[PDB]
Amino acid sequence: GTRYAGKVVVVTGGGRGIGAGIVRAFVNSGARVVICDKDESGGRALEQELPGAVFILCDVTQEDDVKTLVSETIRRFGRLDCVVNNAGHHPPPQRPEETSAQGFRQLLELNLLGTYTLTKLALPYLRKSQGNVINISSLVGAIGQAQAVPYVATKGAVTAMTKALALDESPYGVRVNCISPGNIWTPLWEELAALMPDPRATIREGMLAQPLGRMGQPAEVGAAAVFLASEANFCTGIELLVTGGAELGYPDI
Amino acid sequence: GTRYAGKVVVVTGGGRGIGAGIVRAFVNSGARVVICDKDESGGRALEQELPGAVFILCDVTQEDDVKTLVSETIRRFGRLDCVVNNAGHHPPPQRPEETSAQGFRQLLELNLLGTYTLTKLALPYLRKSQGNVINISSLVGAIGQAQAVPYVATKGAVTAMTKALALDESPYGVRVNCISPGNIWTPLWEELAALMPDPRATIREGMLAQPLGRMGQPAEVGAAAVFLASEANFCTGIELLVTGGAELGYPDI
Amino acid sequence: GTRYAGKVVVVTGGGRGIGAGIVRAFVNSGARVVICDKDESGGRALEQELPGAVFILCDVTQEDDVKTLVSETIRRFGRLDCVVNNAGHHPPPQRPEETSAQGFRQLLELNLLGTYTLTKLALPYLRKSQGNVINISSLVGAIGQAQAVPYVATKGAVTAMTKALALDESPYGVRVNCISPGNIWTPLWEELAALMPDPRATIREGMLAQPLGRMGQPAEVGAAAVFLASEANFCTGIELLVTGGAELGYPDI
Amino acid sequence: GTRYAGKVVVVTGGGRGIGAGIVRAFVNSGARVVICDKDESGGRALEQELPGAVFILCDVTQEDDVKTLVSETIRRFGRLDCVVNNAGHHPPPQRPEETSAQGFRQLLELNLLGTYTLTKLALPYLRKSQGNVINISSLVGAIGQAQAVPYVATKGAVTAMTKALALDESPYGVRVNCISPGNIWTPLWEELAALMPDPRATIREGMLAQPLGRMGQPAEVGAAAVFLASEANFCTGIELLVTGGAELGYPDI
Numbered sequence A, B, C, D: 001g002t003r004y005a006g007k008v009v010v011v012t013g014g015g016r017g018i019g020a021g022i023v024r025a026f027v028n029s030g031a032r033v034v035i036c037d038k039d040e041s042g043g044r045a046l047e048q049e050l051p052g053a054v055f056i057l058c059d060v061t062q063e064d065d066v067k068t069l070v071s072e073t074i075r076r077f078g079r080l081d082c083v084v085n086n087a088g089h090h091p092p093p094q095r096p097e098e099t100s101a102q103g104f105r106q107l108l109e110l111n112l113l114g115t116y117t118l119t120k121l122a123l124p125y126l127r128k129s130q131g132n133v134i135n136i137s138s139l140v141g142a143i144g145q146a147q148a149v150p151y152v153a154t155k156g157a158v159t160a161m162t163k164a165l166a167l168d169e170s171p172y173g174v175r176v177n178c179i180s181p182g183n184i185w186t187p188l189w190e191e192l193a194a195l196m197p198d199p200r201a202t203i204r205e206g207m208l209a210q211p212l213g214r215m216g217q218p219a220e221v222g223a224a225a226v227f228l229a230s231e232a233n234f235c236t237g238i239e240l241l242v243t244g245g246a247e248l249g250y251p252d253i
């Protein structure tokens, strides 16, 4: 209840799923949280539910939305300590030949450039507060995934960008880290499974892909984010895996 | 002289630097090579120098240039076995706050989407020949680099995309691998060093960054590419480091 | 003060350095802690200092010492939730030709087999409590270090063993993770530096090896351990880097 | 036929399996090869079969056997250019609680210390020839394996030791690299499968564990070793994966 007391946190895509889990974890740690989302429904309800959280409508692909997000955060709360770049999307499974350069550009705009833009606008304030950046990447950036060339590329870019920015901001005392979740049960997971011939089988397969035998929860990603913000003062440029062990483990012609 | 006899290889950015080293290595292995470059000077001379290599002017950011590159390769040589996506650029050192979203988009167009576009157009022919893709990424995609947020992000994306496509093309017998060079002495390296206050010191520092005490050569990247194409039949989705050991090795307040 | 209330933790090598930092972090989280060490001086004082911590003399290379450590922990506290395998040593710098197979065997006994033995004896109790194992490995297991072939080998073994055991214990609900610290300012660090021609220069070089510009503290490793035990319920088989960014970042003949 | 002409190579465990594949690849590259094995049957036949290969009985766990192996190599051929540390063993599947410290020590003697001992005795000669070391590790050192805690630990140690020694020998011009194979069809693979309830199912599962849909061949590991010895002059401290993509790719309670 006090690990991050007096601090101000912005969470993008905070209206549902992992983002909402991160919002709740930071509020529970004593922080004030700005919920950014492009959709009003979940984030507005979350603002009413949680004392200490407020909602600001902001599409992270729109530079002027992001400029206003930062200026309103400072105007309302007087400081900025942590930026969690969680907004992102996974398209449905797509064979490589079914992808397009334009679809790839659009996914880069959200998953990569939206993270870049908010971070850039927030860094002057994070320097003043010796704050930190947390990017939500993905395990599949590191190990690959089938039928997801554009998505995987965007997450490889986020993980690498995290390390580069960690180097650049280290002299100024600003840490930059990422979390790479595996299968987390969220509305996006539920939506993608509903597109499949047998959604139930797809979900069962998703649970069994982890040695722990279940999918992860938004709250577990949230606890990892609070650790990185509040207690990981010698960690910068790390990739914190929250995957349940999915990356572990496993005639000649 | 026979390791890759009878095969046809396309090398992007083949007119100088690493690309030219790769062209030479494939010609020396017995292959016919198409040198793709946006600039005529080096590639045209290389075509006159090397029996077995020809030059095609092609800017990999221009989709119609790439369509013609593939169709002319097939028209002239009847098959396509290997695509080496080497074209790319490193901008001068840039602090994060000096970068722009537009500059980042432009670098993604070259370093990431040009690789994506040629690979996509070539894959139908690579499937027919059980051929392979070799992407030239960078060590700094894996470990980061200072004053290079956009560049590092593009190379993290290439390495990750390599793994995704390896998964997708494995059922069809097409391998997809990448090479991550470190400091290789090329005209780009020489150009970036010339921008520095003390170019000589910058170069000395570049040599000393490797345990081997020198920078690498285009020919060494070329030998790695020939290995991946011609002899690495059980390797797919790998990142082959050609870095001289730069990634190895290295009061409390 | 309540994150790990009601839990029982064993920390090997807990009498000074990182181990003592981990002991303090767990006591501060509400746990009861058993301090294991082969030397009485630091651990006995720590027991007098901290309500909630007790000291048991135990050399982790001696199987009967470890059997008694576990049986006394259960006899005194009725449960066991977490085992932190921190005991270990770094020999002075040794050129490869100056090492011996016997010295290598002895270092394996401590850094690898002592971790193995305690974990094995503790696992039946950790299964009953759905507890977890935390091994203290090293960044240099992943990236190498000069003049330390035996040490580096032992830490590569610990990190790999962590992943194997994570797979084996996942069906039983026991998580197994490791922390890989970089330069942490401890009595071992101070002792090794004192062996050098210029200890002050060695220390300055150690601080500058991290982008953060300082060495880490035992308390920071301790916070990472408490996170892994108490809040990382979807993490198993991970390597949590606590290195200050040392692994990030960096004529041809 | 000339890539490694005039060079002298020692391959441990060269009498069958991967080792024999490596022997054949080096003979085919023009080298003279010393086949080391603890068993006479396969290696003696291989010596009769291959002009350019000879067999020396040597158990790599016996220091005096290894001393004689090196001295006889020099006495007979006048130089030593490459040492391939391939001898090793995988025990049958063993649950962690079924392993013993003594069994673990014995496996370390073979898989780790035998590699260490030959490398140490060979390094003075490798320095004279600017030669190189190739260690045969395993993919499972990096990602883990079930029911194999000791084996996985030994291979994590080999991969890490490779990086440490690469750092130490870089000033002297000696490269040190490793190959991490995945499922390679060898007599050890066949022996382990024969211990299983359904050996046929075990083998089918082994083939399907790779995106390429088959196991690898000794010849493919051999080609990777010849590349590392003869053409990878800017590679040191690398881990070359020969795994067919096994490491790629993949309700909340």
Ligand SMILES: NC(=O)c1ccc[n+]([C@@H]2O[C@H](COP(=O)([O-])OP(=O)(O)OC[C@H]3O[C@@H](n4cnc5c(N)ncnc54)[C@H](O)[C@@H]3O)[C@@H](O)[C@H]2O)c1
Residues within 6 Å of the ligand: A012, A013, A014, A015, A016, A017, A018, A019, A036, A037, A038, A039, A042, A058, A059, A060, A061, A086, A087, A088, A089, A090, A110, A114, A136, A137, A138, A139, A180, A181, A182, A183, A184, A185, A186, A187, A188, A189
């Ligand atoms: N769910 C998983 O298994 C999983 C695994 C690995 C990584 N991730 C990553 O975690 C993040 C969150 O995923 P999720 O499963 O919670 O997804 P989700 O779709 O359930 O939630 C994403 C939220 O982001 C918002 N958002 C989308 N585009 C936005 C934009 N332009 N501007 C502002 N907000 C925007 C959405 O409205 C939504 O509220 C994403 O980056 C995703 O790539 C998820």
Ligand SMILES: NC(=O)c1ccc[n+]([C@@H]2O[C@H](COP(=O)([O-])OP(=O)(O)OC[C@H]3O[C@@H](n4cnc5c(N)ncnc54)[C@H](O)[C@@H]3O)[C@@H](O)[C@H]2O)c1
Residues within 6 Å of the ligand: B012, B013, B014, B015, B016, B017, B018, B019, B036, B037, B038, B039, B042, B058, B059, B060, B061, B086, B087, B088, B089, B090, B110, B114, B136, B137, B138, B139, B180, B181, B182, B183, B184, B185, B186, B187, B188, B189
């Ligand atoms: N030199 C190094 O140290 C180093 C290190 C790691 C990775 N790399 C990568 O290796 C690749 C080659 O680098 P280099 O040092 O040889 O560079 P270079 O600048 O010397 O050569 C690059 C070549 O690509 C061509 N090219 C550029 N844009 C193109 C386009 N749009 N279409 C077609 N051709 C185009 C250029 O005209 C040039 O001939 C790049 O991907 C670079 O990122 C280089």
Ligand SMILES: NC(=O)c1ccc[n+]([C@@H]2O[C@H](COP(=O)([O-])OP(=O)(O)OC[C@H]3O[C@@H](n4cnc5c(N)ncnc54)[C@H](O)[C@@H]3O)[C@@H](O)[C@H]2O)c1
Residues within 6 Å of the ligand: C012, C013, C014, C015, C016, C017, C018, C019, C036, C037, C038, C039, C042, C058, C059, C060, C061, C086, C087, C088, C089, C090, C110, C114, C136, C137, C138, C139, C180, C181, C182, C183, C184, C185, C186, C187, C188, C189
């Ligand atoms: N200090 C660093 O920079 C650093 C970096 C990476 C990893 N590590 C690892 O962290 C761990 C702790 O290192 P440290 O710097 O705190 O060392 P330290 O020497 O300051 O403390 C080690 C403690 O372990 C105890 N110990 C040693 N052998 C023992 C045995 N056989 N049985 C029981 N206790 C034993 C010692 O008596 C001592 O109290 C080690 O595993 C080390 O390899 C340290």
Ligand SMILES: NC(=O)c1ccc[n+]([C@@H]2O[C@H](COP(=O)([O-])OP(=O)(O)OC[C@H]3O[C@@H](n4cnc5c(N)ncnc54)[C@H](O)[C@@H]3O)[C@@H](O)[C@H]2O)c1
Residues within 6 Å of the ligand: D012, D013, D014, D015, D016, D017, D018, D019, D036, D037, D038, D039, D042, D058, D059, D060, D061, D086, D087, D088, D089, D090, D110, D114, D136, D137, D138, D139, D180, D181, D182, D183, D184, D185, D186, D187, D188, D189
């Ligand atoms: N087969 C695979 O799928 C696989 C996968 C990854 C790694 N590996 C590694 O590859 C290496 C070779 O494996 P393999 O499948 O060919 O095994 P194998 O059992 O078929 O052949 C091993 C050879 O080494 C010899 N050998 C064993 N102990 C020895 C000793 N003390 N001294 C000298 N020679 C000795 C054996 O007599 C045999 O000829 C091992 O290090 C193994 O760990 C194998």
Ligand SMILES: CN(c1ccc(F)c(O)c1)c1cccc(-c2cccc(O)c2F)n1
Residues within 6 Å of the ligand: A090, A091, A092, A093, A094, A137, A138, A139, A140, A145, A146, A147, A148, A181, A182, A183, A184, A188, A189, A192, A193
């Ligand atoms: C939410 N998401 C996901 C999963 C894991 C990650 F690491 C990640 O970043 C995102 C989902 C959700 C449902 C199915 C699939 C999915 C699986 C296999 C191939 C694909 O193309 C997929 F889309 N992926």
Ligand SMILES: CN(c1ccc(F)c(O)c1)c1cccc(-c2cccc(O)c2F)n1
Residues within 6 Å of the ligand: B090, B091, B092, B093, B094, B137, B138, B139, B140, B145, B146, B147, B148, B181, B182, B183, B184, B188, B189, B192, B193
């Ligand atoms: C060619 N290039 C390069 C080097 C290594 C790589 F792995 C890579 O992909 C590219 C260069 C060339 C000269 C100086 C620098 C460079 C160094 C440190 C920060 C920077 O911003 C740099 F630009 N980089």
Ligand SMILES: CN(c1ccc(F)c(O)c1)c1cccc(-c2cccc(O)c2F)n1
Residues within 6 Å of the ligand: C090, C091, C092, C093, C094, C137, C138, C139, C140, C145, C146, C147, C148, C181, C182, C183, C184, C188, C189, C192, C193
């Ligand atoms: C405590 N220790 C250490 C440091 C970093 C680690 F990741 C680690 O596991 C241990 C020390 C302490 C002082 C000097 C050196 C050291 C440095 C370079 C070569 C060597 O051989 C060394 F011994 N290492």
Ligand SMILES: CN(c1ccc(F)c(O)c1)c1cccc(-c2cccc(O)c2F)n1
Residues within 6 Å of the ligand: D090, D091, D092, D093, D094, D137, D138, D139, D140, D145, D146, D147, D148, D181, D182, D183, D184, D188, D189, D192, D193
């Ligand atoms: C030869 N070997 C092997 C396989 C892959 C490697 F990367 C490696 O280093 C060795 C075998 C052969 C047959 C079955 C198994 C095996 C599989 C799953 C759990 C185990 O305990 C096993 F023993 N492993």
Ligand SMILES: OC[C@H]1O[C@@H](O)[C@H](O)[C@@H](O)[C@@H]1O
Residues within 6 Å of the ligand: A016, A017, A018, A185, A186, A187, A190, A218
């Ligand atoms: O829709 C799947 C899951 O999404 C998560 O974000 C919510 O917290 C869960 O209540 C829900 O079951």
Ligand SMILES: OC[C@H]1O[C@@H](O)[C@H](O)[C@@H](O)[C@@H]1O
Residues within 6 Å of the ligand: B016, B017, B018, B185, B186, B187, B190, B218
């Ligand atoms: O310009 C730096 C270097 O670039 C390389 O691509 C050329 O092969 C060298 O001859 C040249 O010295």
Ligand SMILES: OC[C@H]1O[C@@H](O)[C@H](O)[C@@H](O)[C@@H]1O
Residues within 6 Å of the ligand: C016, C017, C018, C185, C186, C187, C190, C218
């Ligand atoms: O000896 C170096 C350092 O060791 C740490 O374990 C102690 O907490 C510090 O007080 C001390 O300065």
Ligand SMILES: OC[C@H]1O[C@@H](O)[C@H](O)[C@@H](O)[C@@H]1O
Residues within 6 Å of the ligand: D016, D017, D018, D185, D186, D187, D190, D218
């Ligand atoms: O025993 C399995 C396989 O082992 C390999 O080393 C041999 O080259 C093959 O001929 C054999 O089928």
Ligand code: NA
Residues within 6 Å of the ligand: A046, A047, A048, A049, A050, A051, A052, A053, A054
């Ligand atoms: Na509120």
Ligand code: NA
Residues within 6 Å of the ligand: B046, B047, B048, B049, B050, B051, B052, B053, B054
């Ligand atoms: Na020509």
Ligand code: NA
Residues within 6 Å of the ligand: C046, C047, C048, C049, C050, C051, C052, C053, C054
């Ligand atoms: Na006490």
Ligand code: NA
Residues within 6 Å of the ligand: D046, D047, D048, D049, D050, D051, D052, D053, D054
């Ligand atoms: Na012979």
